[PDB]
């Protein structure tokens, strides 16, 4: 459900694009993934859309409408939700987060540890700003790591921040737990977008899943995008795999039932809870290339999209993951400020992210194109495929000088 085209209509070599098909098929043959789905589009037309391998090992083939846990790739969708409330005048980037979340008046920061292993806690210099929350520079800790080296992360893990009974609970816990750092000091991947999801609930007066269905998924035609997979769509859900240590062979992932996508979550996570299809995500990506509109439906003003896809980071900062030199960070996505500085082939201003289950995307406004990759494989395989898909896509692209 985007117009199909020949590769040459998007400016691609058919022969060199086939090297991307071959590479995906090699990853299935060598048992690195069960299967996956890829969409490449330029000038609003699909140039390549391909399903590979199987939905489940020794099972049916991967359908193109397969449903995937996008994890941290949910993040930029929450960012679009926040920017809709921005256009309605409900929050400003210079606003203290404490105006929206009053309990954040009680924030404390972890300084050192004392002799008894407990963090030394100090009232925060000031409330983090909304721009810091949108850019992972607000000083919040991470929620999936038992790191004795990072006391703030260990406390979040121990308090079970990400498995709270509600977003109200999650945000009350964060208010009482130690921050990793004072706001504005460094970029560090955090629970910031899960806190953003609470602000959507509080400002919209609707639950996060309802607001996103009404303002994003319904208007853009994203039919299978949600915080769970209803019983009828379960047969299209791709299975999640990990590598057996010492065999390097595909094994069902064991991750705990809090992440289960069979039921509506109690605390829907704006940083990691969405499931989607390559086609639904392709529609979202085309809406960003079109600066806020798809098929006559406008969800954001063009200036608002332009503001999201710029680097909002101070001069100095280091984006340390994409799920490097010349990398910055906009509103809930990475921004390639100067890709040449790392010999990256994407155009300057390219936005991207990826999830822990292996999913990745990039949108390149300078080259009017996007790539959506969907697998369900934990570990380093996803990030390797991202880098290799970027190399093979730009080697197939033929531009004027
Ligand atoms: Na799909």
How far, in whole angstroms, is CA 125 from its chain's centroid? 30
How far, in Å, are 31, 271, 274, 344, 352 from residue 387 at the CA level? 19, 23, 23, 9, 12
Please state, in angstroms and as integers, the Cα–Cα distance from residue 285 to each residue in 128, 280, 331, 361, following that order: 30, 9, 15, 9
Buried b (16+ CB within 10 A) or exposed e, 262-278: eeebebbbbbbbbbbbb
Task: Return the residues preceding each gap in the chain, C–N over 2.5 A, or none.
Answer: 323
Q: Which two tokens stand for residue 66?
A: 């397969």
- CA of residue 52 to ligand 1 center, whole Å: 11
The neighbouring-strand residues paired with 335 are 328, 351
Burial class (CB within 10 angstroms; exposed 0-12, middle 13-18, buried 19+) of 97: buried
Rounded to the nearest whole angstrom, what is the distance from the C-alpha of residue 76 to the centroid of ligand 1? 18
Cα(308) to centroid of ligand 1, in Å? 26
Pairing label, strands 241-243, 178-179: unpaired
Describe the strand order of the beta sheet including 334-336 as a list of residue ranges.
45-53, 35-42, 369-374, 360-364, 350-354, 334-336, 327-329
Report the distance separating Cα 332 and Cα 82, nearest Å.
10
What is the Å distance from ligand 1's center to 113 Cα? 46
CA 356, CA 242: separation in Å to the nearest integer? 11
Cα of 126 from ligand 1 centre, angstroms: 44
* Dist. CA 23 → ligand 1 center (Å): 18
* Centre of ligand 1 from the C-alpha of residue 89, in Å: 35
Q: Within a 10 A sphere around the Cβ of 227, how many other Cβ atoms?
A: 22
Query: How far, in Å, is the centroid of ligand 1 from the Cα of 373?
Result: 9
- Measured from the Cβ of residue 313, the count of other Cβ atoms closer than 10 Å reads 21
Query: What are the Cα distances from residue 109, in Å, to 23, 162, 186, 199?
Result: 46, 20, 14, 22
Longest dimension (CA), the chain: 67
Rounded to an integer, what distance in angstroms lies between the CA atom of residue 287 and that of residue 291? 6
Backbone φ, ψ for residue 261 (5° rounding): -105, 15
Cα of 132 vs centre of ligand 1, distance in Å, is 33
Q: What are the C-alpha distances in Å from 200 to residues 44, 172, 196, 382?
A: 30, 16, 6, 30
Give the Å distance between the CA of 192 and the centre of ligand 1: 27
Between CA 241 and CA 255 the distance in angstroms is 10
Q: Backbone phi, then psi, for 20, in 5-degree steps?
A: -70, -45
Give the position of tokens 């064991």. 254
* CA 230 from centre of chain: 22
Cα distances from 341 to residues 309, 328, 351, in angstroms, run 19, 12, 16
Distance 339 CA to ligand 1 centre (A): 29
CA–CA distances in Å: residue 18 to residues 23, 80, 184, 339, 393: 9, 34, 45, 25, 10
Cα separation, 394 vs 358, whole angstroms: 21
Given resolution (angstroms): 2.1
* CB within 8 Å of 176: residues ≥ 6 apart: 106
CA 10 to centroid of ligand 1, rounded, Å: 22
> What is the distance in A from the centroid of ligand 1 to the CA of 356?
17
Which residues lie below 8 Å from residue 227, measured CB to CB, with a gap of 6+? 208, 209, 261, 264, 265, 268, 273, 274, 275
**Cα–Cα distance, 256 to 191 (Å, whole number):** 19
Q: Over the range 59-86, which residues count as b (16 or more CB within 10 Å of their CB) and which as e?
A: eeebbebbbbbbbbbbbbbbbbbbbbbb
Cα 64 to averaged position of ligand 1 atoms, centre (Å): 5
Please state, in angstroms and rounded to a whole number, the distance separating the CA atoms of residues 21 and 242.
23
Contact indicator for 283, 225 with CB cutoff of 8 Å: no
Ligand 1 centroid to 199 CA: how many Å?
30
Intra-chain end-to-end CA distance of the chain, in Å: 32
Structure tokens at 308: 């999201």
**How many other CB atoms are found less than 10 A from the CB of residue 6?**
10
Angle at the Cα of 378 (from 376 to 382), degrees rounded to 5?
75
Rounded distance from Cα 274 to ligand 1 centre (Å): 13
Distance between Cα 361 and ligand 1 center (Å): 13
Query: Rounded to an integer, what distance in angstroms lies between the CA atom of residue 351 and that of residue 330?
Result: 8
> What is the rounded (10 degree) CA torsion for 373, 376, 381, 383?
40
The Å distance, Cα 285 to ligand 1 centre, comes to 14
Give me the long-range contacts of 18-26 (CB less than 8 A, separation at least 24).
Answer: 19/392, 19/395, 19/396, 20/48, 20/389, 20/392, 20/393, 20/396, 21/48, 21/50, 23/388, 23/389, 23/392, 24/50, 24/52, 24/385, 25/52
Give the chain as a 3 state SS string: CCCECCHHHHCECHHHHHHHHHHHHHHHHCCCCCEEEEEEEECCEEEEEEEEEECCCCCCECCCCCEEECHHHHHHHHHHHHHHHHHCCCCCCCCEHHHHCHHHHHCEEEEEECCCCCEEEEECCCCCEHHHHHCCCCCCCCCCCCCCCCHHHHHHHHHCHHHCCCHHHHHHHHHHCEECCCCCCCCCCCCHHHHHHHHHHHHHCCCHHHHHHHHHHHHHCCCCCECCCCHHHHHHECCCEEECCCCCCEEECCCCHHHCCCCCCCCCCCCCCCEECHHHHHHHHHHHHCCCEECCEECCCHHHHHHHCCCCCCCCCCCCCCCCCCEEECCCCEEECCHHHHCCCCCCCEEEEECCCCCEEEEEHHHCEEEEEECCECCCHHHHHHHHHHHHHHHHECCCC
Tokens of residue 41, six digits: 């589009």
Residues with Cβ within 8 Å of 46's Cβ and at least 6 positions away in sequence, in order, are 2, 3, 4, 5, 39, 40, 282
Nearest to 376 by CA among 238, 251, 245: 238
What is the Å distance from ligand 1's center to 286 Cα? 16
Burial class (CB in 10 A: 0-12, 13-18, 19+), 340: exposed
Contact between residue 323 and residue 336 where contact means Cβ atoms under 8 Å apart: no
Quote the tokens at residue 14.
Answer: 């058919």
Residue 306: burial class (beta carbons within 10 Å; 0-12, 13-18, 19+)? middle
Distance of CA 234 to the CA centre of its chain: 22
**What's the gap in Å between 277 CA and the centre of ligand 1?**
4
Best CA proximity match to 238, nearest among 271, 277, 282, 281: 277
């Amino acid at each position: 459900a985007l117009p199909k085209g020949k590769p040459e209509e998007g400016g691609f070599s058919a022969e060199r694009l086939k090297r991307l098909d071959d590479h995906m098929q090699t990853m299935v043959d060598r048992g690195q993934i069960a299967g996956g789905v890829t969409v490449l589009a330029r000038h609003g037309r699909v140039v390549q859309a391909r399903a590979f391998g199987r939905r489940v090992l020794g099972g049916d083939p991967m359908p193109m409408d397969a449903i995937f846990r996008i994890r941290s790739e949910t993040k930029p969708v929450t960012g679009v939700a926040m920017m809709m409330l921005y256009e309605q005048g409900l929050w400003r980037l210079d606003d203290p987060v404490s105006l929206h979340i009053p309990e954040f008046a009680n924030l404390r920061v972890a300084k050192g540890v004392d002799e008894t292993g407990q963090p030394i806690l100090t009232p925060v210099s000031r409330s983090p700003t909304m721009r810091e929350l949108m850019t992972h520079t607000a000083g919040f800790a991470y929620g999936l790591a038992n790191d004795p080296s990072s006391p703030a992360d260990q406390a979040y893990y121990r308090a079970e921040v990400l498995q709270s009974a509600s977003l109200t609970d999650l945000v009350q816990k964060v208010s009482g737990l130690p921050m990793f750092a004072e706001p504005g000091q460094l970029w560090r991947y955090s629970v910031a977008a899960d806190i953003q999801g609470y602000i959507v609930e509080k400002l919209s007066g609707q639950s996060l899943p309802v607001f996103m269905q009404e303002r994003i998924f319904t208007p853009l035609g994203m039919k299978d995008t949600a915080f769970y997979v209803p019983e009828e769509k379960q047969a299209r859900l791709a299975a999640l795999y990990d590598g057996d240590p010492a065999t390097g062979q595909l094994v069902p992932a064991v991750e705990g039932a809090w992440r289960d996508v069979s039921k509506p979550p109690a605390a829907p996570l704006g940083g990691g809870g969405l499931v989607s299809t390559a086609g639904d995500f392709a529609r979202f990506a085309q809406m960003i290339l079109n600066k806020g509109e798809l098929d006559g439906v406008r969800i954001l003003k063009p200036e608002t999209v332009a503001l999201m896809t710029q680097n909002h980071l101070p001069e100095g900062f280091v984006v340390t993951t994409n799920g490097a030199a010349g990398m910055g960070y906009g509103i809930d996505m990475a921004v390639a400020v100067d890709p040449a500085a790392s010999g990256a082939p994407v155009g300057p201003g390219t936005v991207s992210w990826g999830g822990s289950a292996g999913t990745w995307f990039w949108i390149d406004p300078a080259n009017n194109l996007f790539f959506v990759g969907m697998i369900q494989r934990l570990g380093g395989v996803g990030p390797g495929l991202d880098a290799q898909s970027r190399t093979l896509v730009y080697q197939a692209l033929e531009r004027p000088p």
